[PDB]
Amino acid sequence: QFRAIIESPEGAGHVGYQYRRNTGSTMRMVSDVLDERVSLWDFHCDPSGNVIQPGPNVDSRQYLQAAIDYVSSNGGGTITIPAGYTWYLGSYGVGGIAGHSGIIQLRSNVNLNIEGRIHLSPFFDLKPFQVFVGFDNGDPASSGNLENCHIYGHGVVDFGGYEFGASSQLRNGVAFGRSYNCSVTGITFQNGDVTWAITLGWNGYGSNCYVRKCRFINLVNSSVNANHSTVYVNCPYSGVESCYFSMSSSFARNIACSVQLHQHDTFYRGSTVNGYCRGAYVVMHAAEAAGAGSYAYNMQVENNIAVIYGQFVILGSDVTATVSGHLNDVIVSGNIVSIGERAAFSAPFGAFIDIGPDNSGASNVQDIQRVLVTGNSFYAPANITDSAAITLRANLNGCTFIANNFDCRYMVYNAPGTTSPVVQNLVWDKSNVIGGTHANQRAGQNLFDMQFASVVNSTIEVQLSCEDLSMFSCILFPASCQLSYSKITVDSAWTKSMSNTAVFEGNQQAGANVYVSYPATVNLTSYNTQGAVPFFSTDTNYAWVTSAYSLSINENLDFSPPATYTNKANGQLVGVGYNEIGGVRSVSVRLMLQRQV
Amino acid sequence: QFRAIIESPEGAGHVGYQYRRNTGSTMRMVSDVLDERVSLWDFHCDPSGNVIQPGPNVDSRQYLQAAIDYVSSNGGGTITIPAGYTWYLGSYGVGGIAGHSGIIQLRSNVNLNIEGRIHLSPFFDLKPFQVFVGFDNGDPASSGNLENCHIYGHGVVDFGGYEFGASSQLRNGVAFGRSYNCSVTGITFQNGDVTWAITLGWNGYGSNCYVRKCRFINLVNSSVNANHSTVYVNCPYSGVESCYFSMSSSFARNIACSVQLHQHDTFYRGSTVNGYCRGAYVVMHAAEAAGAGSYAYNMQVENNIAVIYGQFVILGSDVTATVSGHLNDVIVSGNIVSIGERAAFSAPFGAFIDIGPDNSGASNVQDIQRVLVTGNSFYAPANITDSAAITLRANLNGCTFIANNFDCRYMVYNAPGTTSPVVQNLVWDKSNVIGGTHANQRAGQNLFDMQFASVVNSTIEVQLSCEDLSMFSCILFPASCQLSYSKITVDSAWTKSMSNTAVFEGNQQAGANVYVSYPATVNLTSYNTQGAVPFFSTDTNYAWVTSAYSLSINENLDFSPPATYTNKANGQLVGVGYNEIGGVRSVSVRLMLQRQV
Amino acid sequence: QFRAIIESPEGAGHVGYQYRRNTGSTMRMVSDVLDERVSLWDFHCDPSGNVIQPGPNVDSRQYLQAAIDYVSSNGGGTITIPAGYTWYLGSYGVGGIAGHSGIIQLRSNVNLNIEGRIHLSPFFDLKPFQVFVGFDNGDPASSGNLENCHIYGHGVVDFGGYEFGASSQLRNGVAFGRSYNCSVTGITFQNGDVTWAITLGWNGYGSNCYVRKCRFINLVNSSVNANHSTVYVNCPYSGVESCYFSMSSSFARNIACSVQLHQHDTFYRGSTVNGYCRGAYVVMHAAEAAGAGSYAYNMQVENNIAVIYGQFVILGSDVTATVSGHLNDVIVSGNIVSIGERAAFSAPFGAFIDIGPDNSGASNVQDIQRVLVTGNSFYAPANITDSAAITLRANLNGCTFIANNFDCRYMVYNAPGTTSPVVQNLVWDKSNVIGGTHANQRAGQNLFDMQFASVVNSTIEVQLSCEDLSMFSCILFPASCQLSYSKITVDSAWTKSMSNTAVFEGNQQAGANVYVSYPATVNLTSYNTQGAVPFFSTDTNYAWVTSAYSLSINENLDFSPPATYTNKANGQLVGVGYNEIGGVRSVSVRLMLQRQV
Ligand SMILES: CC(=O)N[C@@H]1[C@@H](O[C@H]2O[C@H](CO)[C@H](O[C@H]3O[C@H](CO[C@@H]4O[C@@H](C)[C@H](O)[C@@H](O)[C@H]4O)[C@@H](O)[C@H](O)[C@H]3O)[C@H](O[C@@H]3O[C@H](CO)[C@@H](O)[C@H](O)[C@H]3NC(C)=O)[C@H]2O)[C@H](O)[C@@H](CO)O[C@@H]1O
Numbered sequence A, B, C: 001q002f003r004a005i006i007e008s009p010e011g012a013g014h015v016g017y018q019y020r021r022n023t024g025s026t027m028r029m030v031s032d033v034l035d036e037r038v039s040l041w042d043f044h045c046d047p048s049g050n051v052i053q054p055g056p057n058v059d060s061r062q063y064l065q066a067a068i069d070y071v072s073s074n075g076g077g078t079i080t081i082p083a084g085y086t087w088y089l090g091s092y093g094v095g096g097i098a099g100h101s102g103i104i105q106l107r108s109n110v111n112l113n114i115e116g117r118i119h120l121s122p123f124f125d126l127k128p129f130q131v132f133v134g135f136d137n138g139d140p141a142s143s144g145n146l147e148n149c150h151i152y153g154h155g156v157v158d159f160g161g162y163e164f165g166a167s168s169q170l171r172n173g174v175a176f177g178r179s180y181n182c183s184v185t186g187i188t189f190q191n192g193d194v195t196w197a198i199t200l201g202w203n204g205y206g207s208n209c210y211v212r213k214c215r216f217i218n219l220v221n222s223s224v225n226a227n228h229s230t231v232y233v234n235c236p237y238s239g240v241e242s243c244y245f246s247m248s249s250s251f252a253r254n255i256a257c258s259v260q261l262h263q264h265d266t267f268y269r270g271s272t273v274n275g276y277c278r279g280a281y282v283v284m285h286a287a288e289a290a291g292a293g294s295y296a297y298n299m300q301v302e303n304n305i306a307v308i309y310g311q312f313v314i315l316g317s318d319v320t321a322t323v324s325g326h327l328n329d330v331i332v333s334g335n336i337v338s339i340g341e342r343a344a345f346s347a348p349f350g351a352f353i354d355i356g357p358d359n360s361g362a363s364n365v366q367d368i369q370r371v372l373v374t375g376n377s378f379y380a381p382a383n384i385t386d387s388a389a390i391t392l393r394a395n396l397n398g399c400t401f402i403a404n405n406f407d408c409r410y411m412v413y414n415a416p417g418t419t420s421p422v423v424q425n426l427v428w429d430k431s432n433v434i435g436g437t438h439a440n441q442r443a444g445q446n447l448f449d450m451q452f453a454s455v456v457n458s459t460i461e462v463q464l465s466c467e468d469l470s471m472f473s474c475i476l477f478p479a480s481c482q483l484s485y486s487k488i489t490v491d492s493a494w495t496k497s498m499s500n501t502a503v504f505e506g507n508q509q510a511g512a513n514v515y516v517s518y519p520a521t522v523n524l525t526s527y528n529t530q531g532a533v534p535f536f537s538t539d540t541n542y543a544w545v546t547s548a549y550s551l552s553i554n555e556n557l558d559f560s561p562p563a564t565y566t567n568k569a570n571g572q573l574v575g576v577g578y579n580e581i582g583g584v585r586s587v588s589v590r591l592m593l594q595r596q597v
C-alpha cells in the first residue's frame, strides 16, 4: 500500500525531489533534504514517537541529550533549539558529567544554535549545577577532550533567578572542559546566582576558545554567593571580545569579576562592564599550570569600557609545593574605567591596577614583570578616598606606566603596616597625567605613598596639572623603605606653595645611585662683600645636592642671590651672587634641588 | 481521497518523516519540518494563495509586513528575504509607523535575514521615508519598545538614487525605535540621499544596540539634503564596530558625518571612513536626556581609519529650559585620520578634535571634561590652512592630549574675534609630536593660537621636531586672554633662529601662578672689572624671570658671560661672568628664560 | 499515475504546503520550500542522478563546480558543504582558472558555507594548486571581477600535508581575484606547505575584502617552500581581524609572514601569531600599483599578539621603470610582541620595526614617511644579540615612536659597512621606555647604533630605566654619518658610571643646528684667588658647549666649584666658583654638557 507508506514515518523517503527541476541535479527523496538539518523537535518526543510541547512542566533535558548523542554519532552537525519556545531543564544528567553537577553533556563537532530560550526549572533551586559540560569524566584529569563545539544564536540561557543554597556550591552555564576550538557567540546569559557563566579550558589544557558578542546580565543575586567570575579563561590562545556584562545586585559590587585570564596568549577586548567589583584578573596560578606551562605571557586587556566598584585589572602569580607560576609580557591599553558612585571604603579598595597577594594572603611569592599600562583613562569620584592608579600590595618585579590619565585619590598606594612589598622596575613616565578631581581632599595623604620594603630600578616622574595644597606630599618614602638605583622627580609646576614635595623619611635620596629632583624652600645668608659675593644656606641638610637653581624672582635692586648653587661638605648650599652695594643679605628662595640630574 | 489531500495545501501534513530513519526520533510530518523555517515566499502571494514574482512593478511591502506580523504572533523567529531576487517596496505602511513615514514595521523577536536585495520604487522619489521602523506609535513618547530584533545577512538595501524633495524631509533605513537588544550585521546600505542609514534608540530609551560589519555607500547625492549622519546612537550600552563608510558626492564633504554617539557607554571602533565631512559627534543633547540621564560618559572612539574633509571628532553638550547636558569620561585613541585633498577653506575647518558650539551657535553652555586624546595620528596636506589638532570654539572644562602625532597647520586654534571660550584643564603633554608638513607655510600665524577669554589649570608643552621659521610664534596669548595657574613651555630645539617663541601680548606670564619657559635673545653689558664681573641686560622686561641660562656659545677668549642669570627689581637680568682681562663687554646671547620652572 | 509522479523526481512538486496552516500564506509545493536551500548533495551524483558518497577515492571537484555554476546562473545564493563528511578534491579545474593551477572557480554572489571538511587528495602531492580561484581568465589583467562572494562556517580546508615539489611552484587556498565585497569567516586552514592561505585583490583591483575569525595552522612544512605569507591583502578598504596563526616548522621561523598589507586603507587587527618569522609587511610595490594608485596610506597594525623569530612589522616601498611607490600614513599601536626562544643569529635579525630594502636589495628607492609607532610592547630574551626596536636598513623619510616599551638588545640599529641609509624625521620621544633584560650583555655595543649616511630633522631622547655599564655608549654616530638639524639627548639617570654616553666620532654635535645634551666627566683647575674664583677645564674639546652644570657633590669645605659653566674660544669650559680660602684647586666632576638646550 502506497498510501500506507506515504503516511508512515518513511513517507518522505518515497517522495522524489530534484533541486529546482535541474536535470543535472541529484535525484533525491524529500527525507534526504530534510535530513540536512536537525532540531530539538526531532528528539523531543514520547516513547511512541509523538512530539511533546516544551513548557514549565516538561523536562527537556533527556531529549536534548538524545539529539546531541545522535548527531555526535554521525560526525557532528548543528542542532537548532527553536525560536518562539522556552525549553526547560529539570533534572541532572548522568555519567561523566554527574561529577560536575552537569545537566547537558556537550560532544565534539556538535554545535548548538540556540534561537529560543533555555530556562532552569525549580528543581535546581538552592542546588549546584553546570548547564552544559564538555568533560566526559567526573575527574577532569581523566577526561577526554571536547573539540569543535560552538554555541551561537540570538537565544537566551536563563538561570531562573534561584539563589545559591550554600556558599560552597558551584554553578556554571557552559564548561567546555578540555576544550579545543570551542566558542560561544551571540547568546544572552541572565537572571541567576552563579559562580561563572562560561569557563574555557581546564588547567591549561585547551586551545582557541572564544566568547564573542555575548551578554551577561544579573548573574549574582544573593549574600550566599561566595565569588563570581563571568568568564574564566583557562586555556591558551583564547579570549573574550565585544561582550556586555552587567550586574545590579549590591553583592556583585563586592564579589563579581567579569573575566579571568589565566593562561598564555589570552585576551579581553572591546567589552563593556557595569556593576561589577572587578574587571579582569590576569594571573598564573601554579595549581593551574599542567596543560600549558608555568608562565602566563602575552596577556592583553584592551579597549574596554568599565564602571566597577573595586579594581579594574588585578595581577597575580603564586606557587605550590612543586610548581612556580610566573606572569610576564602583559599589556593593558585603551581602556576607559571609572569607579562608580559609592561611599569611601564601602567596597574593595578602588584601583586601576592591583598587584594582589595570593589566595592565602601571601605577598612574597609573586613573579610579575614586563607589564605595560598605556593609554588608559581612570576616574574616581572625589569622595572615594580608597582609589588609586595602582595598589601595589605584593612583590613586584616590574610594571611600566606610560601616557595614561589617572584621576583618583592616589597614584601609587599600599597601606602602611600591612604587607611590605619588594618593588623592582616600577616605571611611572612623566607622560602620565594626574587629574584634579581629588584636589583639596588629600589632607594627611601622600599622592605617591611608597609603603614598601624596598624600591630598586624604579622611576617616578611626578607631574601635576593643577594645584592640590591639601596633600601632605607628592611622594613619600618611609624610613623602612630602602631606595636605590632609582630616579624620583617632582616637576615644579603647581608646587610653589607646597611645604613638602618629595619626602624621604630615611634620607634615602642620599644614596649613591639615587637620581632626584624636587622643589624646596631654602634660607640663605651672604657675606658682606661688595661685588661677587657668596650666599650660603642656613641649614645643613643638603650634603646630597649636586646642584640647585632659583625658582623665585628677586625683588631687590641692590643685590641678587645666585641663580645656581652647589653644596659644601658640611651640608650647606653655596652659590655666587652679586652685591651692587655691600652688606650681609638674608633671603628665602624657592629652589629646584637636584641630585645627579 | 488521498490524492486530493496530498495535492492540497495540507498534503505535506500527511507525509510522514523521521529524522535519518532514527527509531528514537520524533514521528513527524513533512510540513512540521518545513514549518521550522519561513521566508518571504510564504507570504508573497495573491488573494488566492498563488505566489507572486517580485520585480520593479510589484510592491512587496504588504507581503513582508504580513510575514513579520505572523511570525510576531508565534513568539518570533527569523524571516529570510531570499537571495537571487530584488524585492521592491512601493507604498507607505499604515498605523503607528505612518507618523515616521514608515514603510515596514519591525516587531519584537522577529529577525530579518536579508540575503537578497531590497530596493525602493520610484513612488518614493522626492518623498520622505523610513524603511524599517520599530516604533509602534506616531508619537515616539507613546511608543512601545522593540526588543530582540536583528537584521543580518549578505544582502542589500538600495535607496534607489532618489534625491530629497525638500530639505525639511527626513529619510532613514532602519529606525529601531525604543530599542533593546537590536542589531544590524553584514548589510550593505547604498545609493541614496538620506538623513541617516540606521538609528538606534530614542532619546536615551534603549540598550544593547549594535551595527557591525555593515557597509554604507553613497548615501548623500544632492544639494537639497540638509544634513546626514550615517548611524545615530541614541541609547546607552550600544555602538558601531568594524563598518565601512564611503561617499563620493561633493555635498557629503560638507554635510555628512559617519556616527553620532549621544548616550553613555557607547562606542565607535575599527571602522573605515572615506569622503565624509565628519567622523563622529560625541554629544549630550539636553533635549535627548529622557531615557538615560543627563550625562554622556564612557564614550569611546578607537582604532578607526578616516579620510574626511572637516572634523574627525566633535564634542558637545547643551541645555534646555529644564535640563542640562554634560559630557565627560571620553577616550579617543588609536585613530589614523587625514583631511583629504582640498583647497583651503573649501569645506568646514579641518580638525582632529573640535569643541563645537551648540546647534544655535551658543559657546557658553557646554560642560565637557575628562577627555583623553591619545595615540592618534592626524595629517593634513600642506596647503590646507584650515587644519588644526584642536579647534577650541566653545567653553571647555577639560581635555587631555598625550602621545599623539599631529601634522597640520595649527595645534590649538580658535578664530579671533569670534567666540571667546573659557578654557579649563587643557593639557597638551610634551609627548605630542608636531609634524613638519606645514613648515614654511605659517607666515603671520601662531602654531598654538590661544584666542580665548581665559585659560586656567592648563598645560602646553611645545616640542618642535623640525624648523619652521615662517611662523610668527609657537604660542601666542592675546591681551584679552587671562592666563593663570598654568604651565607653558617651549623646548629650545629647532628654535634658535625664531624671533618670537612664546608671546604674551598682555604680559600674562608674570602671573603669580604661571610657570613658563621659552627661548629669547638678550643683549647684555658688563662692568669693566677684571675677574668675576656682573653682566646686566640692557632691556628691563624681565621682572618675571626666575632664572635664565645660556643657549649660545662664547666665541671670546678674554672673557665669558654668565652661564646663568637671575633678575633685579627693575626688570634687568643679572649674572656673574668672568673677565680674564678687564673691560666693559657687550654681548647678544640666546637664553632659556624660566619662570618658576 | 499519481503514485508514479510522487515517486518520480517531480514528486515533491505535487505535494502541497502552506506555512503553519496559515490561511493567508502562499499555497506552495514541498519542492518550492526545499528549493530555498541548496547543498553539495544536490550536485554530487552520477550521470543517472544517483547520489555519490564522498571519500578519499572520490573526486568531488566536478560536483562542487556544477553546484557553483548552477547557483551563479540564478543570481546567487549559498551552497552548503555538509558537516560530518570530508569532501576530497582530486583534479584541476578547467578554463580560466587553469592558468592559476586552480581547482574550483568561485563565482559572483555565490557563497560557500563550509561546515564539513575539504581535503586535497594525493594527486596534488608535489604539485602547485590554488584551491578556490575568483579570476575567470588565466591572465589576471584580462580577468573579470568576483563580487559578493563569502566563504564562511565552522569547517576546514586541509591541504593534505603535501610538500612542495619545487621552490618555484605556487600554492594558495583562496584567491579571490579582482575581488569586491568578498570575505572568509570562521574557517580553519591547516596541514600544508603553501605560499599563501588567502589572497585578496589583484594589484590594487578590488575593495571591501576581509578575513575574520579564521585559523591558519601548520601551513609550511618543507625546505623546498620558498616563501610564505598567510594572507596577502592586495586591494584597498580590506583587512584581517581576529584571526589565529600558528606554525610549528623550523622552516616557518625563517620564511613565513602572517599578513601582507599592500594597498591603501588596509588593516591587521586583534590577531594572534605564533611560530612565524614575520608579523606583517606594510609595503607599496610599484609593480602592484595598477588598480588603486601608487600610494599605500592609512595602513593600520593594531592590538595583535605575536611570538615571532624575525621582524614584527616590515615597511617598504619601491619603483619600476615607470611607477614609483610611496608608503605614508601608517599606524602601529597596541601590539604585544616577543622574539621567541632562539639562539642569536639563528633566524632573520630580530626587530619590532624593520625598514627593509626592496626585493633586489636596493636601499635608495624607498619613500616611507608619516609613520606612528605608539603604545606597543616588545621583548627579546637576553641572549638574542640580533634584536632591535628598529632595524633601519633603507632610506627613511620619517617614522615617529611615542610611548612604547622596548626590551631588547638595540634600540636603533643598522649593520655597519652594509647599506648607508639616508634618514629624515626619525623621532624617538623620551616617553619610550628602554627595558633592562639585556643589561650586562652589551660589551662593545652601542644602544642606538647610528650607522647611516646621514640623519636630519631627527630626535633621539634616550632615557634609561636601569644601569647597563657593559655598553660602549648609549648613542654613537660614526664619522661617516652627517648629522644636522637634530636633537640628541641622554638623560643622566643610571649614567653616572658610564665612560661614554653619547659619542660623535666626527664631532658632529658641533653643527650649527644640532641640539644636544649628555653627561661627561671633566677635569677642572682653578686660579689661586681667595673669593669668587674661576675654574677651567684642562681639556679643550668643549668649543661646542653652550652651558654645563654639575652632576656631582662637592666633598670640600674650603671651596666649591662652579654649579654652572660656559665655554671659551679655545674650547675650555669656564665657570665661577668660590674659594673660602685661597689656593689652586683641582677637581674631577660629572657635568651635564649642553648645546643649544
Ligand atoms: C569565581 C572565580 O573564578 N574566582 C576567582 C578565583 O578562582 C578560584 O576560586 C574559584 C571559586 O569559585 C574556583 O574554585 C572553586 O572551583 C574549583 C574548580 O571546581 C572543580 O573543578 C571543576 C573542573 C569541576 O567542574 C567542579 O565540579 C569542581 O570539581 C574547586 O576546585 C575549588 O575547590 C572551588 O573553590 C576556581 O577554580 C578554578 O575554576 C576554573 C573554572 O571552573 C577551573 O578551570 C580550574 O581548574 C579551577 N582551578 C583550580 C585551582 O581548581 C579557583 O581558581 C581565583 O583564584 C582568583 C585570583 O585569580 O580570582 C577569582 O577570585
Ligand SMILES: CC(=O)N[C@@H]1[C@@H](O[C@H]2O[C@H](CO)[C@H](O[C@H]3O[C@H](CO[C@@H]4O[C@@H](C)[C@H](O)[C@@H](O)[C@H]4O)[C@@H](O)[C@H](O)[C@H]3O)[C@H](O[C@@H]3O[C@H](CO)[C@@H](O)[C@H](O)[C@H]3NC(C)=O)[C@H]2O)[C@H](O)[C@@H](CO)O[C@@H]1O
Binding pocket: B099, B100, B101, B140, B170, B175, B195, B196, B199, B201, B202, B203, B227, B228, B229, B232, B234, B257, B260, B281, B283, B285, B287, B288, B316, B359
Ligand atoms: C543628520 C543628523 O543626525 N545630524 C546631527 C544633529 O541632529 C539634529 O538634527 C537632525 C537633522 O536631521 C535631527 O533632527 C531632525 O529629526 C528630528 C527627529 O525626527 C522626529 O523624531 C523621529 C523619532 C521621527 O521618526 C521623525 O518622523 C520625526 O518626528 C526632528 O525632531 C527635527 O525637527 C529634525 O530636524 C536630529 O534629531 C534626532 O534624530 C535622532 C535620530 O532619528 C532621534 O533619535 C532623536 O530623537 C532626535 N533628536 C531630537 C532632539 O529630536 C537632531 O538631533 C545633531 O544635533 C548634531 C550635533 O550633535 O550633529 C548632527 O548635525
Ligand SMILES: CC(=O)N[C@@H]1[C@@H](O[C@H]2O[C@H](CO)[C@H](O[C@H]3O[C@H](CO[C@@H]4O[C@@H](C)[C@H](O)[C@@H](O)[C@H]4O)[C@@H](O)[C@H](O)[C@H]3O)[C@H](O[C@@H]3O[C@H](CO)[C@@H](O)[C@H](O)[C@H]3NC(C)=O)[C@H]2O)[C@H](O)[C@@H](CO)O[C@@H]1O
Binding pocket: C099, C100, C101, C140, C170, C175, C195, C196, C199, C201, C202, C203, C227, C228, C229, C232, C234, C257, C260, C281, C283, C285, C287, C288, C316, C359
Ligand atoms: C609569499 C609572499 O607573498 N611573499 C612576499 C613577497 O611577494 C612577492 O613574492 C611572492 C613569492 O611567492 C609572490 O610572487 C610569486 O607570485 C607572483 C604572482 O603569481 C602570479 O600571479 C597570480 C595572480 C597567479 O594566480 C599565479 O598563477 C601567478 O601567475 C609571480 O608573479 C611571481 O613570479 C612569484 O614569485 C608575490 O606576488 C604577488 O602575489 C600576490 C598574491 O598572489 C598577487 O596579488 C600579486 O599580483 C603578486 N605581485 C606581483 C608583483 O606579481 C610577490 O609580490 C613580497 O614582495 C615581500 C615584500 O613585501 O614580502 C613577502 O616576501
Ligand code: NA
Binding pocket: A099, A100, A101, A138
Ligand atoms: Na566536581
Ligand code: NA
Binding pocket: A369, A370, A371, A372, A398, A399, A400, C405
Ligand atoms: Na614593561
Ligand code: NA
Binding pocket: A452, A453, A454, A480, A481, A482
Ligand atoms: Na625595608
Ligand code: NA
Binding pocket: B099, B100, B101, B138
Ligand atoms: Na514624525
Ligand code: NA
Binding pocket: A405, B369, B370, B371, B372, B398, B399, B400
Ligand atoms: Na583627561
Ligand code: NA
Binding pocket: B452, B453, B454, B480, B481, B482
Ligand atoms: Na578675557
Ligand code: NA
Binding pocket: C099, C100, C101, C138
Ligand atoms: Na599563472
Ligand code: NA
Binding pocket: B405, C369, C370, C371, C372, C398, C399, C400
Ligand atoms: Na609620524
Ligand code: NA
Binding pocket: C452, C453, C454, C480, C481, C482
Ligand atoms: Na655620509
